[PDB]
Amino acid sequence: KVHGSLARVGKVRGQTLKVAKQEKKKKRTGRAKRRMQYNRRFVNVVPTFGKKKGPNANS
Amino acid sequence: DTVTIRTRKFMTNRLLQRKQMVIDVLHPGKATVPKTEIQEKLAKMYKTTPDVIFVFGFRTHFGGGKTTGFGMIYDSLDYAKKNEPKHRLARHGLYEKKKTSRKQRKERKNRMKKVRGTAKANVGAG
Amino acid sequence: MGKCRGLRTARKLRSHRRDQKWHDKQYKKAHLGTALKANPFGGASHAKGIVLEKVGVEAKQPNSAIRKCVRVQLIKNGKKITAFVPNDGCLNFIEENDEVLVAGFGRKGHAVGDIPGVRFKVVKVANVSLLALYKGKKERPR
Amino acid sequence: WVCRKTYVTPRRPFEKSRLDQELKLIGEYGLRNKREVWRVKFTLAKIRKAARELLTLDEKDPRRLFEGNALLRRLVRIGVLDEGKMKLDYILGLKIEDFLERRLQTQVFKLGLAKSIHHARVLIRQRHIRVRKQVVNIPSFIVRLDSQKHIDFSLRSPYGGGRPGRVKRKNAKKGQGGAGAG
RNA sequence: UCAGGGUUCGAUUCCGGAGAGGGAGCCUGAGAAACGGCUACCACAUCCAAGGAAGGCAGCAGGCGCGCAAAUUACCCACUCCCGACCCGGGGAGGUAGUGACGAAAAAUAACAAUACAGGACUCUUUCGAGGCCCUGUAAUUGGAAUGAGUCCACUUUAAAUCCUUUAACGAGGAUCCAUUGGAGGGCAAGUCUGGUCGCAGCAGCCGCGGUAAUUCCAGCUCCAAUAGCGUAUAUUAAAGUU
């Protein structure tokens, strides 16, 4: 149902849970962020048979 | 330290009665020493004694190792004392300034403007 | 093709082009200035006004929603503009009979999305952004 | 007073093909951003434009001679071009990577004392090298051909003669106030 | 901005012109129809013992107002030049500092070994397996090494000072000496992951997402782009052989 009118704003954001798991780990900047990006993609060297994988996959 | 004073493009500037060169200085593990110390060594390289020597400039390059300035050497005192911009004479004292700050001049001037005949009150008196 | 290619026909070219340029839509708005006179803006990127009162604005089909706009009168013209309010719960951070700062959508004359009759949106309530009100890194100054 | 830009942005915002080339090029030489890449490619494409004029000018025009002669000298003086070539056609055979070989950080690594290229950039900035007599802090020196036989470490550093750092002399004072009096 | 041909802008540091609240008249001088000169009218505004008198910041600062929209009632004639009867005097011209993410250039935010797993050329072995090399991240702690960011005596800078460069003494173990701004359905580089909502709330330049199994909403985690910058609105050029 919807009870207490559907014109009401703040609805979806005021009934959602608020949680976090904020970092303790410090991320890199500038030079080293590119260094890891280079090595992790190309100089590993893992790749195998034709696949769709992407650099993300939480599936 | 042990430091080197080294010439560069001398001129015998007869019209102003002085000798102007560049003060090219090398310093090994240090750089940027007092200007007073520099003119001592130049005193005992042309035997003109250090009260008619005047130097200024002296910007020091990165990492030290060199500094370069500009120096005059007058033949006599009175040729310096006459020619010389005032602040360079007062740089190692023999002259001052006063005068006195700025402003107290202009506000007095406009008050002097609005009297005639007698302005001796405003010159002393406000 | 199908047109003069003389050697002394500079006049017949440069007078023809100066006429047939006015049939273009864009050119005809820029140079008559009827744009300026008709708009509630002076050509300024933003503008400032004072709230008149909240409204609810229905959506165009297929979509059905209520979009919670405002209606505002301006400082320097006194004419009225109907302006959208962004993200959820930001309506509450706008209070009636205060000043606001408006801005166009990003289509430069035309009504955007499924909402009709709205051509403007709202960015700052009172020297404070809708972002910092929404996110919670600032608070109402009153 | 007078200011101008030294780089340009790509016309396309994204393109899988382009991004990989710019990434892998930055990986080799230890560059910080693409702004350090596009800078090089602006200068190169500028030189490629000037050359593209003179080839279309009449052979033995005085403008064509004096420009080309003094131009190619400069390309040889930095060492991106040989004098066994010495004509304008080889300007168009020049490309991006040859420049980057003459970068300071590249020459430290290639012909001197370093670990990986990522190390060598840090040595340049922390004032442990010189070029003939002169300290530098700029890894984008681009290095003239004559000055490659004068790349040396610095004469005041813990690397070679000169005073130690504050990690060593700290630990030396741990022998006197950390375990000698504390 | 741009292949060629063009298009758009030019209040604004150089040169020329016009004007000092709006109009008109005029004195002086070689030069002015001058406004840091004058007279009158008109519009304003100030003082007054009400008899009278005095004024023009589109000069530098500063205030009110107007708006989306813009700095110190600072220091100084040393430089650069100008003015005078003058080598000496004066100059808010001009120089110096303050405010300053308009904009431009430079380039830090951790580099190197130990152990630990991990990959493949290489070697031995029928293979299994083992050795070993080149490197990779990644865990675990660390270890050695380095430096300015800051703090800061001295010198230097200059009219006097600041800044910069130069140099004492302090100054890095990652928990802090903390990089953010946007995005992840397609256009367009990156999630048919988990929780909540259920055509409601919202997102969406465009095409479209939400009606209880949401790859697009609200959050978490992860990933992508650019990076000391990034987003948004508006004018305008290229894209447009859609002038």
Instruction: Compute the distance between CA of residue C95 and CA of residue D73 in angstroms, rounded to an integer.
Output: 72
Question: SS3 for C127?
Answer: coil
* Contact predicate D138/D131, CB 8 Å: no
Instruction: Compute the distance between CA of residue C111 and CA of residue C117 in angstroms, rounded to an integer.
Output: 6
Instruction: Compute the distance between CA of residue A38 and CA of residue D24 in angstroms, rounded to an integer.
Output: 6
Beta bridge partners of B12: B19
Return the structure tokens found at C133.
Answer: 């009100």
* Contact predicate C85/C91, CB 8 Å: yes
B51-78 CB burial, b ≥16 within 10 A, e <16: ebbbbeebebeebbbbbbbebbbbeeee
Asked if A31 and D27 come within 8 Å (Cβ–Cβ), the reply is: no
Chain interruptions in chain A, by residue before each (C–N > 2.5 Å) = none
Residues 6+ apart with CB under 8 A from B83: B16, B17, B18, B74
DSSP per position, C75-125: SSS--EEEE---STT-STTS-SSSEEEEEE-SSSSS--TT--S--EEEEES
Nucleic strand E near CB of residue C127 (< 7 Å): no
Return the structure tokens found at D35.
Answer: 């702004």
State whether residue A12 sits within 8 Å of chain C by CB: yes
Closest CA to A42 of A30, A32, A52, A55: A55
Closest CA to C69 of C93, C91, C47: C91
Domain extent, residue D182, equals 13-182
PDB experimental method: cryo-EM
Gap from D179 CA to E193 C1', Å: 55
For residue A23, report the phi and psi dihedrals to the nearest 5 degrees.
-70, 150
* Contact predicate C95/C140, CB 8 Å: no
CA angle B111, B112, B116 (to 5 degrees): 125
Return the structure tokens found at C113.
Answer: 């999305």
Residue C127's Cβ-side half-sphere holds a number of Cα atoms within 13 Å equal to: 2
Residues 6+ apart with CB under 8 A from B36: B92
Beta bridge partners of C66: C58
Residues 6+ apart with CB under 8 A from C130: C86, C87, C90, C93, C122, C123, C124
Residue D4 resides in a domain: no
Nucleic strand E near CB of residue D127 (< 7 Å): yes
Residue D6 resides in a domain: no
Domain boundary assignment for chain C: 1-142
Domains held by chain D: number: 1
Instruction: Compute the distance between CA of residue C135 and CA of residue B114 in angstroms, rounded to an integer.
Output: 66
Q: How far off is chain D from A51, nearest CA to CA, in Å? A: 17
Q: How far off is chain D from B64, nearest CA to CA, in Å? A: 9
State whether residue D26 sits within 8 Å of chain A by CB: yes
For residue D114, report the phi and psi dihedrals to the nearest 5 degrees.
-165, 170
Task: Please state, in angstroms and as integers, the Cα–Cα distance from residue B24 to each residue in B42, B58, C13, C105, following that order.
Answer: 11, 9, 72, 66
Closest CA to D19 of B88, A15, A55: A55
Residues 6+ apart with CB under 8 A from A3: none
Instruction: Read off the CATH number of the domain in which B82 is found.
Output: 3.30.70.3370
Q: Say which DSSP state D178 is in.
A: S
Nucleic strand E near CB of residue A20 (< 7 Å): yes
Which of chain A's residues have a Cβ under 8 Å away from the Cβ of C88? 9-13
Return the structure tokens found at D132.
Answer: 């003939």
Nucleic strand E near CB of residue D63 (< 7 Å): no
Gap from C32 CA to E87 C1', Å: 67
φ/ψ region of D144 (left if φ > 0, alpha if ψ in -120 to 50, else beta) reads beta
φ/ψ region of C71 (left if φ > 0, alpha if ψ in -120 to 50, else beta) reads beta
CB atoms within 10 A of CB C122: 22
* Contact predicate D104/D124, CB 8 Å: yes
For residue C132, report the phi and psi dihedrals to the nearest 5 degrees.
-65, -30
Nearest nucleotide relative to A46: CA against C1': E119
Return the structure tokens found at B34.
Answer: 């007092």
Domain extent, residue B92, equals 1-126
Residues 6+ apart with CB under 8 A from C18: none
Which of chain C's residues have a Cβ under 8 Å away from the Cβ of A9? 68, 88-89, 91-92
Q: Which residue has the tokens 């430069």?
A: C108
Instruction: Compute the distance between CA of residue B24 and CA of residue B21 in angstroms, rounded to an integer.
Output: 9
Query: How do strand C46-51 and strand D134-135 relate by DSSP bridges?
Result: unpaired
Partner-chain residue, chosen from C56, C68, C88, that has the shortest CB–CB distance to A13: C88
C65, closest residue in chain A (CA to CA): A7
Beta bridge partners of C122: C102
Return the structure tokens found at B116.
Answer: 């005639």
Return the structure tokens found at A50.
Answer: 């034709």
Instruction: Compute the distance between CA of residue C140 and CA of residue D20 in angstroms, rounded to an integer.
Output: 47
Nucleic strand E near CB of residue B61 (< 7 Å): yes
Domains held by chain B: number: 1
Residues 6+ apart with CB under 8 A from D39: D6, D7
Alpha-carbon torsion, ordered B86, B89, B94, B100, to 10 deg: 30
Gap from D24 CA to E29 C1', Å: 80
Closest CA to B8 of B18, B21, B19, B27: B21
For residue D28, which amino acid is it?
Answer: E
* Contact predicate D114/D108, CB 8 Å: yes
Instruction: Compute the distance between CA of residue D45 and CA of residue A18 in angstroms, rounded to an integer.
Output: 53
Task: Please state, in angstroms and as integers, the Cα–Cα distance from residue B69 to each residue in B7, B20, B54, following that order.
Answer: 11, 11, 11
Beta bridge partners of D102: none
Residue D3 resides in a domain: no
Interface-testing mutation among D19, D21, D24, with chain A (most A C-beta atoms within 10 A): D24
For residue D8, which amino acid is it?
Answer: V
Instruction: Compute the distance between CA of residue A41 and CA of residue D23 in angstroms, rounded to an integer.
Output: 10
Residue D48 resides in a domain: yes
Angle, helix D104-111 to helix D117-125, in steps of 10 degrees? 120
Interface-testing mutation among A29, A31, A39, A42, with chain D (most D C-beta atoms within 10 A): A31
Which of chain A's residues have a Cβ under 8 Å away from the Cβ of D33? 34
Residues 6+ apart with CB under 8 A from C29: C35
Outline where DSSP puts E strands in chain D. 129-131, 134-135, 151-153
Which stretch of DSSP H or E encloses residue D168? helix D168-172
CB atoms within 10 A of CB C116: 12
